[PDB]
Design a protein around this nucleic acid. Structure first.
Ligand SMILES: [Mg+2]
Ligand SMILES: [Mg+2]
Ligand SMILES: [Mg+2]
Ligand SMILES: [Mg+2]
Ligand SMILES: [Mg+2]
Lengths: 78, 141, 142, 77, 227, 103, 313
RNA sequence: ACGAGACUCUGGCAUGCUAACUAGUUACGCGACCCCCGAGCGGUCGGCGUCCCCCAACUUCUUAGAGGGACAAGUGGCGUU
RNA sequence: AUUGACGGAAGGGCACCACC
């Protein structure tokens, strides 16, 4: 199916909004960060959340995605 | 003088462990030669590593396989995989990595199963039919 | 040098049977012509000299995995039984054929009684089987 | 402030046995046996102040469980 | 010694002993608020720990009933004399115990009380005792001579998966009445609490909990202290 | 001095492994040659019944099972020292069986 | 006229190249640590067909290898991994001798002393712990350590004030006094997590870099701050140069070489254009190493390659 | 919010960790048999032993614990990007 | 006028207890 559910997406979004300064586009370092900063009860949910976090950080670079509010708004002086 | 490696190979429930040491070109499975293993229809499956790599690549080693588990065909696929993996691991550990790369490319290009195990196993029967997926015949009227 | 493992077993058994039949020292029971070799057979063996072949086969089966008895010998020679309209099942071989064969081999000085229990191969049995294996391996390469 | 709430006490239990029970940990200051009004036995509660807040903090993990007079007693702050 | 038995049969026999002892105590100490039993093996004695709400009636009159229970347990299960002591202990919180609350609802129904006020009272007590959710289902001949089932829910109640084995405790009981037998199902969803006896330790497996970031005042110009 | 063998049996892995850890740690503190935890194959006891009490339905079955785990510890020490290595807060679902070099 | 060129690649990996190491004893052999859980000991056959060939692989760890370093004599390697262990490889056999097993979490970096008597590591459990060449954890610092991970811990090859320089994800560079394992100077400048720390060959300077894209030079004699240079992207690794007064850094997909006398970029090594469709970021350089002669720059990468930059004149 | 998903058990991987005479492997010694010119770091052995504590080590195979590992993560293409 | 069920209505989707 490969369709991530609401728990994965909502958790990923809150993780990004609170810890944007510590996530790159690297699934393994993201996985380690999300296992340090969150309390995820399993390892499959940890991996799915880190995967969606990686996929979203690969979209933050190409414009503000609808749903995430971060400090990146300030640097848009234009 | 301790130049020896023990590597395994698995097909379904079979498991063959090949022991490869320094020696003079001898291959024996369960004490029997390689050309006397029982399903002599599938003899070329057993001979496939030696026929792809030649004899000079085997003429400096002593290989002795010990196979246990599974059926006849699964046992000879385990023998195949264990001989190939044993030669590859011996080459990697004891001569050079270029040679390992060359023989691993020849074997992998011919057939992946000589170095990667087949992950299929039997499924569990369920309580509706004779096997895993089949079901007993249903009747109306 | 050749050993029993380093030769085709199906031809080694024929060579050993011809050896046993040649040297007239194997004891044959009087009922050889009138018996089935198990309760799951349908007829008697098609080979008149079946006793020598069975003795050679169990001599080979005692060279490797020695330490056996009549029970394991009738689970070696057991097969499938077709029960008419009912499904088939594994059934063991006849015990008297196995016991007479092992006792005949014991009379040939080839087989002896193990210490823990069962039967194994004397050094003379090893020597005779290895010499027969040498003969068949030599006669294969000509 | 040396607060001990003994619970699951027995009807036989009086001030003296609780005294002799907590005596191997030291001296006491105030026993409180939650007696029944107009009826002479406990209601299942005891309030103990041990005159020092440290040895009572040792005895809470000591007299826990213990099955006194066929009743396992739960002690707490 | 002369008695030796395979580990399979021994473990099954131990489980069967615990099941029969729990069934006996459930029938015997029903109206005393019996919740569970725990058999603790010690070198000198065998301790049967009875979990009850009203442990003073379990103890009896000056220890009489606990002595009788000890005597029948010894005489039925064939323990050596004096080798089995029965202790009683009070369950910590009564609201988060489906067996105690099912028994409470049972005895409230045995006395003359209406089924709806009784279920609402039990449900309200369970919810006021810290439960995340509760479900009480009473099925039987409630209105007339055509049976129906009335359920009363308040809060969260999970049903499927593995968490329903440690976050939910259930209890089924019967109430014999003049016109028939009533069935009482009570199930309570315990609250999460780390390092506590109130409920489970491990959280729900789909409850991610992000820790709040510390306030990060940033630096302006590099500075270094030589301590 | 004997070859004392402690066998621990349980139905859950957690308490069994923690009791094994306690025994090994206590034995290592008092300088014993401890041949550590040997793990015997877990026995799975399986009973498959019909779900229904009557004989009507869709013929569905219920697969109950119970695992039994076994651990071994080998000590080489006098008896009175193992009498204090053990007897330290054994968990409920664990059962020990000391064998003092003889039946 | 002193720019560099691309002299060839070193294929043969199956993961990112997390660290590269050299040694002044054997100028024909480099070590590369990767994310295919293997370390490769190369043989530099500088010919037309291939610059280098994988001579021998080391296959100990069960996770990514995150650091590696060669001893002074060039005989024993030391590797750290994400499985939480350290291994002291013997290069001749290709097998390990000692396995350090103290660290609970992933070991980000390992270092050796100048005389290889004591070693130090750093990890994701926010501890910096010393060891010795026999295998026992000597002293684990815990007081006033990093509040987050440690990502690069190095020694200082200089007799006077033997110190341990370290940096982590709490945006702090800490200078440890090795004789008493006590903290000595705390540097507070950086505004993002630190991925690397380096010490000058002449034991006077130190460099640090990370997420903020800027590289800060700290004096190691008085704990001051000389200046700060700016790279384009995330600084994944820094590496000083032995022969020349240069500092190299791996900024995103390019490699910037800052001089340290005029403070200008002498060269910005860029990889060639591949995947012409503008749909994916280029592979990022992850590690840097200088040969002892200082005429060769080995650069790890994210497309499982190791590129070889040769300086010209 | 319940259900789905997550969860639990199971299958596949680890020459990395923890260990094992109630599982073995490999060396070594003894023994039997075969060739031989004189043959052998020769071959076969589910024959024996190294559990009298070194007078052998080790965990690849076996067992089962803890972790790791897979996420549509990487590269193209489609898709409202 | 609303909720359900039904239509020998009209459109979509799903399933080897449906088909190809
Ligand atoms: Mg079938
Ligand atoms: Mg048969
Ligand atoms: Mg749910
Ligand atoms: Mg589900
Ligand atoms: Mg059809």
């Amino acid at each position: 199916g490969r369709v991530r559910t609401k728990t994965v997406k909502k958790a990923a979004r809150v993780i990004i909004e609170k810890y944007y300064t510590r996530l790159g586009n690297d699934f393994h370092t993201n996985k380690r960060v999300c296992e340090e900063i969150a309390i995820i009860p399993s390892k499959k949910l940890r991996n799915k959340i880190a995967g969606y976090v990686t996929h979203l950080m690969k979209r933050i670079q190409r414009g503000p995605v609808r749903g995430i509010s971060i400090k990146l708004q300030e640097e848009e002086r234009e | 003088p301790l130049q020896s490696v023990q590597v395994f190979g698995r097909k379904k429930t079979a498991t063959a462990v090949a022991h490869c040491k320094r020696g003079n070109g001898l291959i024996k499975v369960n004490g029997r030669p390689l050309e006397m293993i029982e399903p002599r229809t599938l003899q070329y499956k057993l001979l496939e590593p030696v026929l792809l790599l030649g004899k000079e690549r085997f003429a400096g080693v002593d290989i002795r396989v010990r196979v246990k588990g599974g059926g006849h065909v699964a046992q000879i696929y385990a023998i195949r995989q264990s001989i190939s993996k044993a030669l590859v691991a011996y080459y990697q550990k004891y001569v050079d990595e270029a040679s390992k790369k060359e023989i691993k490319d020849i074997l992998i290009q011919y057939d992946r199963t000589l170095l990667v195990a087949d992950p299929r196993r039997c499924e569990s029967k369920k309580f509706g039919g004779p096997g895993a997926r089949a079901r007993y015949q249903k009747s109306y009227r | 040098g050749v050993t029993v493992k380093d030769v085709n077993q199906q031809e080694f058994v024929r060579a050993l049977a011809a050896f046993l039949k040649k040297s007239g020292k194997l004891k044959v029971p009087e009922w050889v012509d009138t018996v089935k070799l198990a309760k799951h057979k349908e007829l008697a063996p098609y080979d008149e000299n079946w006793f020598y072949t069975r003795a050679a086969s169990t001599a080979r089966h005692l060279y490797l995995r020695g330490g056996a008895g009549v029970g394991s010998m009738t689970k070696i020679y057991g097969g499938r039984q077709r029960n008419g309209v009912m499904p088939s099942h594994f059934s063991r071989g006849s015990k008297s054929v196995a016991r007479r064969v092992l006792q005949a081999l014991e009379g040939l000085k080839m087989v002896e009684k193990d210490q823990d229990g069962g039967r194994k191969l004397t050094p003379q049995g090893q020597r005779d089987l290895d010499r027969i294996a040498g003969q068949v391996a030599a006669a294969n390469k000509k | 402030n040396a607060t001990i709430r003994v619970t699951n006490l027995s009807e036989d239990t009086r001030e003296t046995d609780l005294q002799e029970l907590f005596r191997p940990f030291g001296s006491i200051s105030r026993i409180y046996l939650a007696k029944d009004k107009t009826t002479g036995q406990s209601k299942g509660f005891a309030f103990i102040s041990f005159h020092r807040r440290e040895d009572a903090a040792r005895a809470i993990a000591g007299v826990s469980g213990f099955g006194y007079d066929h009743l396992i007693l739960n002690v707490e702050w | 010694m002369a008695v030796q038995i395979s580990k399979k049969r021994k473990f099954v026999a131990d489980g069967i002993f615990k099941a029969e002892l729990n069934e006996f105590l459930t029938r015997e100490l029903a109206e005393d608020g019996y919740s569970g039993v725990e058999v603790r093996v010690t070198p000198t004695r065998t301790e049967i720990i009875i979990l009850a709400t009203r442990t003073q009636n379990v103890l009896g009159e000056k220890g009489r009933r606990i002595r009788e229970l000890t005597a029948v347990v010894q005489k039925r299960f064939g323990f050596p004399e004096g080798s089995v002591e029965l202790y009683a202990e009070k369950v910590a919180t009564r609201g988060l115990c489906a067996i105690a609350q099912a028994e409470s609802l049972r005895y409230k129904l045995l006395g003359g009380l209406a089924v709806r006020r009784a279920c609402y009272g039990v449900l309200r007590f369970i919810m006021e005792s810290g439960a995340k959710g509760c479900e009480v289902v009473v099925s039987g001949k409630l209105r007339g001579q055509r049976a129906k089932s009335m359920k009363f829910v308040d809060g969260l109640m999970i049903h499927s998966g593995d968490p329903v084995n440690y976050y939910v405790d259930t209890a089924v009981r019967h109430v014999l009445l003049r016109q028939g037998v009533l069935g009482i199902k009570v199930k309570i969803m315990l609250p999460w609490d780390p390092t506590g006896k109130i409920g489970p330790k491990k959280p729900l497996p789909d409850h991610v909990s992000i820790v709040e970031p510390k306030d990060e005042i940033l630096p302006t110009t590099p500075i270094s202290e030589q301590k | 001095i004997h070859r004392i063998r402690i066998t621990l049996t349980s139905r859950n892995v957690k308490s069994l492994e923690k009791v094994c850890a306690d025994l090994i740690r206590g034995a290592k503190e008092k300088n014993l040659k401890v041949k550590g935890p040997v793990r015997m194959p877990t026995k799975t006891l399986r009973i498959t019944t019909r779900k229904t009490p009557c004989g009507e339905g869709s013929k569905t079955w219920d697969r109950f099972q119970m695992r039994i785990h076994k651990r071994l510890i080998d000590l080489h020490s006098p008896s009175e020292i193992v009498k204090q290595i053990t007897s330290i807060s054994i968990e409920p679902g664990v059962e020990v069986e000391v064998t003092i070099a003889d039946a | 006229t002193e720019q560099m060129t691309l002299r060839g690649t070193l294929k043969g990996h199956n993961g990112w190249v997390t660290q590269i190491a050299t040694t002044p004893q054997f100028p024909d052999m480099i070590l590369s640590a990767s994310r295919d859980k293997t370390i490769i000991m190369w043989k530099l056959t500088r010919d037309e067909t291939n610059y280098g060939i994988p001579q021998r692989a080391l296959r100990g760890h069960s996770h990514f290898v995150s650091d590696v370093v060669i001893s002074s004599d060039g005989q024993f390697a030391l590797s750290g991994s994400w499985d939480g262990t350290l291994r002291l490889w013997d290069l001749t056999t290709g097998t390990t001798t000692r396995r350090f097993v103290g660290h609970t979490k992933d070991v980000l970096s390992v270092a050796f002393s100048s005389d290889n008597r004591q070693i130090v590591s750093g990890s994701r459990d926010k501890t910096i712990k010393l060891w010795n060449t026999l295998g026992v954890c000597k002293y684990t610092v815990q007081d006033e350590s990093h509040s987050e991970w440690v990502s690069c811990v190095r020694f200082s090859p200089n007799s006077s004030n033997p110190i341990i320089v370290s940096c982590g994800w709490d945006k702090l560079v800490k200078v440890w006094n090795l004789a008493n394992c006590k903290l000595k100077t705390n540097h507070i400048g950086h505004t993002g997590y630190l991925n690397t720390v380096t010490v000058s060959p002449d034991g006077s300077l130190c460099a640090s870099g990370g997420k903020d894209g800027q590289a800060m030079l700290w004096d190691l004699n008085e704990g001051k701050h000389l200046y700060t240079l700016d790279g384009g992207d995330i600084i994944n690794a820094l590496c000083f140069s032995p022969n020349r007064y240069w500092l190299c850094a791996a900024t995103g997909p390019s490699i910037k070489i800052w001089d340290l006398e005029g403070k200008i970029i002498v060269d910005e090594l860029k990889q060639e254009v591949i995947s012409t469709s503008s749909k994916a970021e280029p592979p990022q350089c992850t590690s840097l190493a200088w040969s002892a002669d200082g005429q060769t720059l080995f650069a790890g990468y994210t497309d499982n390659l190791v590129r070889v930059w040769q300086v010209t004149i």
